[PDB]
């Protein structure tokens, strides 16, 4: 796909694993083998070897630079590069957008609506932050019932 | 207040040329190493007397030659100085957004954004406003001083750590 | 090949379409669109002496109103199609 | 009555032949657009019902499908074999100039009718067998659009079978389907 | 009635502003006093003639300097190893190193090397000697003189044309499409066939042998007999050397496609056929509208009849013909929108498909010629949008445009501005977050942790063009597509050989850095469009100030009340979007110059590894290519790039000088000039000298314009210097 | 005159900040010759910081 070799069989990706441990191994040569800063570089090497063995096992595509490239078209092999964490993101981002929208409706029908935005009512906030879990069923539910959008006759419009 | 605001820029100009003259003057004529038989090799050997009289020397033998350790510090311990060098350029170019612009443009752009919020019933009761003209100048001079001072901080603390 | 027959038949086909087929389609559209109009008046009515529609050149003796401009328009398409055909055949 | 229980819209009352109320997107909502859509649905269908015998009967008699009998014009020499016989006047500039003259004279004479009902069903010279001047008139118009929409769906089938399976024709798609019908369906096109 | 005489209200100004604004309101003809329709259109018509005369008197001096002080014949003998000379230098301030260092191209003195691609152009078109360029310079002196005579003539009352002649849009479009675009491209084709093709094939065709040198072995026989393929019978082979008779063909109108294999440039037979095609189609398209003969179109009834019956476009385009025809700013904005989209189509198609001989090999010339048309196009497009704003203030009538598409743009203008704002914010967070993320991962020692996105949509389009590098194999890269089999005998043997080559710039191999900077480009166009659509649609008024139309177009502000109304005008949105076009085209030409400066010396892996993060842009492009830029002059000595080393520093002056007008504002300088006026009025021996203009500070609109123009001059000179010193000093 | 005191009205004035906004009528002037008698109070301020503005009955509808 797109002229990119897989990273498990890429010679450039294995070259970057070789020259990263060798950079960290030469950093280890000036420390005692049981010393505290040498345990951090030894944990860095095992973090590096975990990283390169994770990138090759996920079917990542590596170019001529030896670097893993993401295919965001919507490929059946490449769902976890953009499509799977994008749907994970939009669920979380729609959770932020739904509990901030539902908080403003809950404080617009209050005695002092502007004091509830500088001082956020946490019992009112936390009872709808739980309610933002099921938000695609509540956003399209408000879209189908007409409560999501406001009619243009009740919207402040600058003159022509 | 606006004279304090402009004197903050002229303090940037004054103090930045002061510390630039300092860094080049002592990297060229003071700081260095002494080998055997009393020979002194400076960091940038003797180029303050000939290159710091032209702006091309200041751009070349100071702002380009000594910035050859803040930009290739990536992948090392001094790479946070490279990151804050670039992010300091970001904060400076972010300052030029607030300094060059004015309130009424941003107020009408915020009016369009408030219309998009009114369409989806997510209008806040605290009305979104553009920053004030004194506040827009304050934000611009704060990012200008922060970004430029952090640029000089990152370049200084990468160069003289690298050659020290 | 056969330039003298391909051009003549293709010009005669488009002139047959211009006189008997698309002449009610063209006469309706030059009356529905009419003369070009700026600000509610004709360009000649607004003061442009060079925008006057010619009538001696448009004075036709054809019973269906098919004038020499329509000869120069439909016959131009018959040569454009006729040289489309001759270039496609000679390949 | 394209969906039992569905409320038919106000612009589709049922008095039209084939008025089953099928307009979810509301394309015929404009009244003057809807009068053009009724004379467009019938010319399309009548061309489609002149096309389904023009596809299957050349294929069932063995002179190829409607694609391989159409590729001769792109070839410099195809000779225009009709019923296994090459016609002498079957050149691409010859048969296109007749088609751009004879059909264009037919379609310009068709568009000249001011009546919005004689544009739909003209009668007279186009009805020599006198079935329009008979006892049944409403059900034959319902027969026109039910047969017509079937051939309109058929020609859509005809076209997208050639895109999905190039080099094969609709009776050859029928013969491919009649052998092992549980393996070779639209799912071969949907799932590659 | 002092200067300025066109505005009475500025003539009574007793300050220096009267001197300033009269320069800047000089061509705003409709804002003048005692000013009418006829004088507007006739002064604009004679100003067009003066503009044409300036363009032709410019080309005449760019031809005279090549013919006089340039080595055009020596460049014609060897276009690969001779630098093209623009003009000689006579500077009294040169020392002997500057005279000895600017002497290039085998000249007798200090000369300037031409980076405008005029030698490549004049070579490809047929000009060979200095006498031909001199004759062209005299001919265009005559043409500019004729245009000055015609400009003076149409201001005389005998030859003054009325506004009804000026607003005749149908006749103007018919004679523009037929004459300007059709008979000039057919005239061109007659040149390219008569002169440029035989001069590429060694035959010297001039005016003395125009009627004798037959362009084809059988000329004008197969044209009128229909067999046009005789004109595509014997094309130029791949062994053809340009300008020589050996290896050449006889066909004048080929359809080969691709490139000439020796020049890496387009075939003159293809460009001749290209012009015969954009000549037949423009003369045929010029018989469209109705002028004088009964047939044709009235565009008023075309726009009236183009209303969707569902009411989604309202009244459609009803009333738009009078809206364009009465508003000169609508026509000028449409012309500049089309001109920006084609000056950018010029820039994109003369680097990838080089049209002139030995232009692809000359690298810094190609870099200049891309940056030229991308900056001239980012000022022409912003002028289009600014003129849309000026149309909405001083030319848009809401009564005439009642519920049409143009009124409905004002009806939903907050939706357009807010969705351009969302798209700009999306592109900005995503492009900045991905570049800053890739910066952090190269900083943290892990290049593999970058989010690198292969631009598979544009790579799929490149494989749709015929690039077999990515292996998509859909159409024109696979042999099973009908488009390939329809093209593989016609143009694709040239095109596939041109696009599968990796040394040229035709559809380059793109990567994750290309993806990221294309989102930078989309950020730049989207945010510039955001500010400009916001200026054009909030031109008449807004919720902060509803009467912006009654304050004119370029008014400064509306006062500190109602929170503060700085930069509220539509001119100020144009002002803020000139910074955004400068940033946009800076990103575009940074990407162009670094994608090409790594292609030309071979190591495209430097761009493929370093363009994904901004420290690679700072270090491997802005710092690495500036090595021989700022060393153009040293304490040790000076090189030939020294003028480009001064012009770089010069840009850093003027740009930063703009900050003085863009940060510091008026009343500080007004009190400063008040103290200066006291000091001059009280100083002995200097009080005797008076001013007639009262010294004031620069006014607020003038301050934004002066800072913007300084910003733009510094921005174009810092990059013209860096770009013409980091490619011409390190060729490759 | 006026719709009602203490009623909810929507502003039809194009150049006001509170166009298509819900406002509460606090005072209607019954003196003749007054062009803008209806005093409408709004929950949100404008850019000048005020919420009190006078409108004609032709520029308001009951909502
Ligand atoms: C309470 C939640 C809420 C909701 C549901 C939205 C939703 C909307 N806003 Mg946003 N916005 C909000 C908070 C909110 N915003 C706040 C706090 C700010 C100040 C930073 C803005 C500033 C703003 C701008 C500048 C823009 C939008 C626009 C948009 C639209 C697209 C989303 C977008 O551009 O990315 C979100 C944009 C941001 C700048 C991020 C702010 C989101 C914060 C982090 C959420 C905070 C909520 C929490 C309870 C406090 C959509 C109508 C765009 C528009 O005009 O509509 C098309 C647009 O131009 N908004
Ligand atoms: C064919 C192209 C073309 C034409 C002739 C017009 C025509 C005009 N423009 Mg325009 N414009 C265009 C393209 C062009 N412009 C482009 C390229 C830009 C982007 C830079 C703009 C940006 C611009 C603004 C936004 C303004 C004009 C205005 C004007 C008027 C001239 C003002 C004057 O004397 O300036 C004289 C200018 C100078 C002396 C400064 C030049 C100094 C250089 C830059 C250094 C006139 C109606 C003004 C107008 O109509 O007022 C309402 C106005 O405010 N134009
Ligand atoms: C056949 C008749 C004829 C022709 C030749 C023209 C010619 C012209 N008219 Mg004209 N006009 C005519 C009749 C004619 N008109 C009629 C009948 C009307 C009456 C309504 C008008 C009324 C009219 C008005 C009122 C105006 C014009 C103007 C112009 C000029 C256009 C501006 C210009 O020069 O840009 C030149 C443009 C081109 C050559 C087209 C190029 C197209 C794109 C942008 C470029 C593509 C070219 C190519 C890629 C570049 C390669 C070259 C590169 C290597 C250097 C041009 C000289 C204007 C002018 O300048 O007045 C002096 C003007 O004010 N005319
Ligand atoms: C406006 C455009 C232009 C003009 C002024 C001319 C002018 C001329 N062409 Mg020419 N030419 C052009 C378009 C042009 N060309 C194009 C479109 C083609 C490509 C098909 C050619 C190819 C062509 C051929 C091959 C020949 C000419 C020749 C001629 C000459 C006489 C034409 C004749 O007898 O009638 C004359 C110098 C003829 C001649 O004798 O030239 C020496 C000749 O046979 N032309
Ligand atoms: C992993 C890192 C990450 C982070 C830090 C960001 C950061 C941001 N993104 Mg982004 N983005 C990411 C992943 C990331 N993105 C991925 C993987 C996707 C692919 C699906 C996108 C696609 C994307 C969308 C589609 C949008 C965001 C938006 C946002 C911004 C505001 C969101 C908010 O507060 O909700 C505010 C409330 C909302 C309702 C907006 C959310 C959009 C809804 C769900 C549709 C925020 C600055 C916005 C943006 O940048 O545009 C202005 C936005 O519109 N991002
Ligand atoms: C590095 C400098 C820089 C940065 C990031 C900003 C920031 C931005 N510009 Mg720009 N701009 C700048 C300099 C810059 N600009 C200067 C020099 C000027 C010239 C005077 C302007 C003038 C300006 C105007 C006139 C407009 C913008 C707009 C904006 C937004 C563009 C949408 C976007 O990218 O959202 C992404 C946000 C970022 C990339 C900022 C990231 C900061 C992170 C979140 C901190 C944590 C954003 C806030 C437009 C706007 O706000 O509408 C949406 C607007 O119309 N800019
Ligand atoms: C509003 C945001 C937006 C805009 C302006 C751009 C702009 C650009 N992208 Mg796109 N694109 C975007 C978001 C966007 N993209 C997102 C969310 C993804 C997934 C990461 C992609 C993935 C993508 C790839 C793979 C490539 C581009 C390319 C391009 C160009 C062609 C248009 C295209 O394919 O868009 C497609 C737009 C979408 C799929 C989403 C539209 C916006 C949604 C609503 C968010 C253009 C420069 C090409 C490029 O960089 O050329 C070298 C290229 O090949 N885009
Ligand atoms: C599935 C069938 C979908 C038909 C839905 C369409 C439908 O709902 O019609 C809605 C609308 C037609 O609106 P008009 O007012 O033009 O037509 C009134 C209709 O009632 C038709 O009579 O069409 C569109 O908006 C065009 C969409 C296709 C856009 C084509 C873009 C062309 C780009 C340039 C090439
Ligand atoms: C029957 C009849 C008649 C007769 C008529 C006739 C005989 C006619 C003819 C007609 C004709 C005889 C016409 C023609 C026309 C022509 C034209 C009008 C042409 C044009 C051309 C063109 C324009 C072309 C173009 C081109 C070129 C030039 C080159 C390039 C390509 C092309 C092809 C495009 C009469 C009256 C007696 C009456 C009775 C009946
Ligand atoms: C405000 C205003 C204005 C302005 C505006 C502007 C300036 C705009 C712009 C806009 C623009 C500037 C746009 C452009 C566009 C373009 C386009 C839209 C294109 C497209 C294309 C196409 C679609 C094509 C197709 C294709 C392809 C893609 C590929 C293949 C080939 C073909 C050809 C097929 C004015 C003046 C009017 C006035 C009023 C107001
Ligand atoms: C951008 C800009 C603005 C607009 C600036 C604004 C609106 C400030 C934005 C502040 C933050 C980003 C919004 C408030 C954030 C809230 C705390 C909500 C949190 C949401 C996320 C940040 C988590 C001006 O008002 C202005 C005025 C005068 C000259 C120049 C300018 C100028 O350049
Ligand atoms: S004079 Fe300057 S500071 Fe005062 S309102 Fe106008 S733009 Fe703002």
């Amino acid at each position: 796909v797109a002229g990119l070799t897989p990273c498990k069989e890429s010679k450039g990706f294995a070259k970057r694993q070789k020259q990263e441990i060798k950079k960290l191994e030469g950093r280890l040569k000036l420390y005692a083998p049981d010393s505290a800063p040498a345990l951090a570089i030894n944990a860095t090497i095992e973090k590096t070897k975990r990283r390169f063995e994770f990138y090759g096992n996920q079917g990542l595509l590596c170019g001529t630079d030896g670097l893993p490239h993401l295919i965001v078209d919507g490929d059946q092999a490449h769902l976890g590069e953009f499509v799977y964490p994008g749907l994970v993101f939009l669920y979380i981002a729609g959770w932020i957008g739904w509990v901030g929208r539902a908080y403003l409706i809950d404080v617009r029908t209050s005695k002092k609506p502007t004091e509830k935005e500088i001082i956020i009512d946490v019992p009112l906030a936390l009872r709808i932050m739980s309610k933002g879990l099921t938000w695609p069923v509540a956003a399209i539910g408000e879209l189908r019932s007409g409560k999501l959008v406001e009619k243009s006759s009740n919207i402040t419009v600058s003159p022509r | 207040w606006d004279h304090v605001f402009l004197g903050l820029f002229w303090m940037y100009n004054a103090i930045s040329v002061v510390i630039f003259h300092f860094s080049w003057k002592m990297q060229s004529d003071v700081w260095g190493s002494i080998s055997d038989q009393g020979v002194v090799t400076h960091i940038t050997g003797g180029n303050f007397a000939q290159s710091s009289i032209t702006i091309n020397g200041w751009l070349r033998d100071f702002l380009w030659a000594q910035a050859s350790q803040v930009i290739q510090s990536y992948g090392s311990s001094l790479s946070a100085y490279g990151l804050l060098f670039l992010g300091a350029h970001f904060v400076w170019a972010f300052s030029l957004m607030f300094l060059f612009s004015g309130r009424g443009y941003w107020q009408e752009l915020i009016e369009s954004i408030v219309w998009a919020h009114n369409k989806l019933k997510v209008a806040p009761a605290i009305q979104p406003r553009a920053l004030s003209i004194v506040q827009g100048r304050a934000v611009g001079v704060a990012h200008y001083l922060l970004g430029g001072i952090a640029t000089t901080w990152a370049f200084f603390l990468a160069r003289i750590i690298s050659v020290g | 090949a056969n330039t003298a027959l391909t051009i003549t038949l293709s010009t005669g086909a488009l002139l047959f379409l211009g006189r008997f087929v698309f002449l009610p389609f063209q006469r309706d559209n030059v009356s529905r669109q009419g003369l070009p109009v700026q600000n509610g008046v004709t360009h000649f009515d607004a003061g442009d002496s060079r925008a006057q529609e010619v009538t001696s050149f448009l004075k036709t003796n054809d019973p269906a109103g098919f004038t020499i401009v329509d000869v120069l328009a439909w016959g131009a398409l018959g040569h454009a199609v006729g040289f489309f055909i001759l270039a496609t055949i000679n390949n | 009555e394209w969906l039992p229980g569905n409320p038919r819209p106000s612009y589709l009352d049922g008095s039209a032949p084939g008025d089953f109320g099928f307009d979810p997107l509301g394309l015929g909502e404009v009244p003057e657009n809807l009068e053009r859509f009724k004379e467009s649905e019938l010319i399309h269908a009548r061309w489609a019902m002149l096309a389904v015998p023009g596809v299957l009967i050349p294929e069932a008699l063995g002179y190829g499908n409607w694609v391989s009998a159409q590729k001769w014009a792109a070839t410099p020499g195809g000779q225009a074999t009709y019923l296994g016989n090459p016609v002498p006047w079957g050149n691409l500039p010859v048969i296109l100039a007749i088609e751009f003259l004879a059909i264009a004279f037919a379609e310009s004479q068709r568009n000249g009718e001011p009546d919005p009902e004689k544009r739909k069903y003209p009668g007279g010279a186009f009805d020599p067998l006198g079935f329009s001047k008979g006892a049944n008139l409403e059900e034959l118009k319902l027969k026109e659009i039910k047969n017509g929409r079937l051939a309109l769906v058929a020609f859509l089938g005809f076209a997208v079978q050639a895109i999905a399976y190039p080099g094969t024709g609709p009776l050859e798609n029928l013969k491919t389907h009649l052998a092992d019908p549980w393996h070779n369906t639209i799912a071969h096109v949907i799932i590659p | 009635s002092r200067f300025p005489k066109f505005s009475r209200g500025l003539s009574q100004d007793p300050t220096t502003r009267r001197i300033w604004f009269g320069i800047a309101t000089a061509h705003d003809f409709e804002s003048h006093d005692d000013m009418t329709e006829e004088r507007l259109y006739q002064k604009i018509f004679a100003s067009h003639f003066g503009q044409l005369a300036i363009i032709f008197l410019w080309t005449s001096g760019n031809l005279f300097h090549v013919a006089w002080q340039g080595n055009f014949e020596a460049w014609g003998q060897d276009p690969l190893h001779v630098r093209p000379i623009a003009h000689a230098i006579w500077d009294p301030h040169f020392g002997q190193p500057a005279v000895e260092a600017f002497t290039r191209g085998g000249a007798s003195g200090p000369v300037n090397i031409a980076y405008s691609g005029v030698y490549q152009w004049w070579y490809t078109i047929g000009l060979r000697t200095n006498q031909d360029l001199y004759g062209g310079s005299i001919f265009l002196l005559f043409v500019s003189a004729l245009f000055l005579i015609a400009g003076w003539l149409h201001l005389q009352p005998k030859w003054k044309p009325s506004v009804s002649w000026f607003k005749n849009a149908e006749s103007r479009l018919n004679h523009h499409l037929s004459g300007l675009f059709g008979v000039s491209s057919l005239a061109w084709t007659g040149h390219l066939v008569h002169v440029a093709i035989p001069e590429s094939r060694g035959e010297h065709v001039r005016w003395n042998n125009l009627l004798t040198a037959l362009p084809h072995p059988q000329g004008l026989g197969p044209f009128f007999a229909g067999q046009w393929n005789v004109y595509a019978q014997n094309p130029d082979s791949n062994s053809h050397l340009f300008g020589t008779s050996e290896g050449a063909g006889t066909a004048i109108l080929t359809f080969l496609g691709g490139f000439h294999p020796q020049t890496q440039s387009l075939w003159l037979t293809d460009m001749a056929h290209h012009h015969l095609a954009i000549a037949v189609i423009f003369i045929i398209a010029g018989h469209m509208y109705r002028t004088n003969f009964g047939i044709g179109h009235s565009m008023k009834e075309i726009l009236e009849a183009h209303t969707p019956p569902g009411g989604r476009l309202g009244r459609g385009h009803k009333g738009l013909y009078d809206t364009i025809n009465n508003s000169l700013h609508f026509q000028l904005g449409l012309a500049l929108a089309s001109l920006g989209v084609i000056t950018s189509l010029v820039a994109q198609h003369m680097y990838s498909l080089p049209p002139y001989a030995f232009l692809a090999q000359d690298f810094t010339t190609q870099a200049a010629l891309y940056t030229h048309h991308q900056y001239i196009a980012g000022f022409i497009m912003t002028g289009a949008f600014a003129h849309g704003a000026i149309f909405f203030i001083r030319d848009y009538n809401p009564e005439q445009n009642k519920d049409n598409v143009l009124a409905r743009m004002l009806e939903h203008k907050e939706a357009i501005i807010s969705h351009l704002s969302w798209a700009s914010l999306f592109l900005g967070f995503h492009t900045l977050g991905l570049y800053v993320h890739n910066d952090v991962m190269l900083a943290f020692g892990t290049p593999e942790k970058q989010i690198l996105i292969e631009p598979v949509f544009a790579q799929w389009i490149q494989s749709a063009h015929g690039k077999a590098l990515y292996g998509f194999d859909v159409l024109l890269s696979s042999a099973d597509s009908p488009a390939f089999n329809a093209g593989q005998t016609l143009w694709l043997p040239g095109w596939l050989d041109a696009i599968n080559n990796n040394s040229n710039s035709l559809f380059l191999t793109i990567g994750p850095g290309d993806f990221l900077v294309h989102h930078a480009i989309a950020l730049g166009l989207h945010t510039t469009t955001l500010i400009l659509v916001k200026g054009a649609l909030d031109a008449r008024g807004s919720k902060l100030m509803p009467d912006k139309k009654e304050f004119g177009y370029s008014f400064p502000c509306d006062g500190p009340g109602r929170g503060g109304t700085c930069d509220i005008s539509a001119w100020d949105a144009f002002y803020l979007a000139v910074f955004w076009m400068l940033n946009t085209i800076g990103w575009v030409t940074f990407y162009w110059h670094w994608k090409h400066i790594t292609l030309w010396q071979g190591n495209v892996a430097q761009f493929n590894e370093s363009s994904t993060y901004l420290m690679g842009w700072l270090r491997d492009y802005l710092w690495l290519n500036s090595s021989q830029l700022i060393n153009g002059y040293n304490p040790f000595g000076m090189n030939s790039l020294s003028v480009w080393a001064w012009m770089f520093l010069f840009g850093h002056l003027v740009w930063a000088t703009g900050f003085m007008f863009l940060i510091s504002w008026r009343g500080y300088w007004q009190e400063l000039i008040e103290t200066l006026a006291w000091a001059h009025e009280r100083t002995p021996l200097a009080n005797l000298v008076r001013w007639k203009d009262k010294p004031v500070a620069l006014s607020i609109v003038q301050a934004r314009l002066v800072g913007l123009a300084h910003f733009s001059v510094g921005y174009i000179f810092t990059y013209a210097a860096f770009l013409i010193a980091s490619t011409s000093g390190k060729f490759g | 005159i006026g719709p009602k005191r203490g009623s909810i009205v929507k502003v039809l004035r194009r150049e006001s900040y509170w166009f298509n906004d819900t406002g509460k009528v606090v005072a209607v002037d019954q003196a003749p010759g007054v062009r803008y008698p209806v005093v409408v109070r709004f929950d949100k301020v404008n850019y000048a910081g005020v919420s009190t503005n006078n409108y004609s009955p032709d520029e308001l509808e009951q909502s």
Side-chain angles (χ1 to χ4, degrees), chain D residues 23 25-30 33-34 37, chain E residues 307-313:
Chain D
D23 200 21
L25 294 175
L27 300 189
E29 182 146 19
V30 193
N33 273 15
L34 183 47
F37 284 174
Chain E
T307 300
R312 292 180 179 90
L313 283 196

Side-chain angles (χ1 to χ4, degrees), chain F residues 11-61:
Chain F
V11 184
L12 275 76
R13 190 195 270 174
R14 291 305 316 221
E15 70 269 18
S16 197
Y17 175 73
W18 301 280
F19 178 56
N20 299 336
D21 270 7
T22 286
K24 190 253 185 182
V25 171
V26 296
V28 185
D29 199 15
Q30 275 81 37
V34 184
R35 284 102 164 99
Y36 305 98
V38 193
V39 187
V40 186
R41 186 66 173 210
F42 303 97
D43 270 358
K44 64 179 73 175
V45 304
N46 69 327
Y47 314 101
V50 298
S51 305
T52 297
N53 195 39
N54 280 47
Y55 309 101
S56 71
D58 291 338
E59 287 162 359
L60 304 161
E61 66 183 1

Side-chain angles (χ1 to χ4, degrees), chain E residues 130-360:
Chain E
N130 286 338
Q131 295 283 341
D132 301 296
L133 311 159
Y134 171 71
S137 68
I138 301 299
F139 175 59
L140 276 187
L141 275 153
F142 172 66
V143 161
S144 69
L146 263 192
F147 278 129
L148 291 164
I149 289 164
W152 171 84
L153 190 82
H154 291 119
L155 295 184
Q156 305 314 111
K158 189 180 177 292
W159 297 277
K160 275 190 211 274
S162 66
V163 193
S164 58
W165 179 90
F166 276 108
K167 295 194 180 169
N168 203 326
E170 281 84 13
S171 187
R172 206 156 91 221
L173 273 176
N174 283 4
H175 298 79
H176 268 64
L177 291 172
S178 285
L180 203 57
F181 293 65
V183 172
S184 297
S185 181
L186 166 74
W188 199 230
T189 307
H191 180 72
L192 282 193
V193 170
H194 264 271
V195 191
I197 280 153
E199 283 279 0
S200 170
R201 301 168 173 172
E203 291 101 16
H204 210 297
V205 178
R206 288 303 172 253
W207 292 113
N208 51 2
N209 51 32
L210 165 66
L211 306 170
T212 61
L214 208 63
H216 206 67
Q218 293 180 356
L220 285 192
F223 183 76
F224 290 118
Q227 62 273 16
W228 288 350
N229 59 322
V230 176
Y231 294 149
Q233 199 60 250
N234 182 34
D236 279 357
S237 63
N238 284 8
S239 67
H240 177 240
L241 272 294
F242 205 86
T244 69
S245 306
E246 56 90 19
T250 59
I252 45 174
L253 308 153
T254 74
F255 203 52
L256 294 174
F259 298 138
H260 188 272
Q262 186 251 348
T263 68
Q264 291 70 243
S265 79
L266 302 173
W267 303 87
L268 280 164
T269 63
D270 279 29
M271 298 188 286
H273 194 200
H274 163 91
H275 288 115
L276 201 38
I278 66 170
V280 171
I281 293 171
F282 271 124
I283 298 177
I284 281 174
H287 296 79
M288 169 152 190
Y289 306 113
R290 179 163 174 175
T291 74
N292 263 32
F293 299 94
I295 67 156
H297 297 87
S298 66
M299 289 184 259
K300 183 177 183 293
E301 294 302 297
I302 291 186
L303 292 178
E304 279 273 327
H306 279 68
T307 300
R312 292 180 179 90
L313 283 196
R315 297 208 305 132
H317 320 93
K318 292 181 181 179
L320 277 183
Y321 181 75
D322 291 331
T323 311
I324 307 179
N325 215 6
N326 294 332
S327 159
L328 272 163
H329 291 267
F330 207 108
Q331 314 159 37
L332 182 54
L334 282 184
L336 289 154
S338 306
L339 194 54
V341 175
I342 76 166
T343 314
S344 308
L345 185 65
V346 163
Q348 299 284 359
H349 298 194
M350 302 176 33
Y351 83 85
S352 42
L353 293 168
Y356 300 122
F358 316 104
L359 190 66

Side-chain angles (χ1 to χ4, degrees), chain E residues 454-455 458-459 462 467 470 508-512 514 518 591 595:
Chain E
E454 208 61 40
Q459 285 173 345
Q462 288 186 0
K467 288 206 71 164
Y470 318 111
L508 293 87
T509 300
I510 49 175
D514 302 74
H518 272 83
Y591 169 43
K595 179 89 171 186

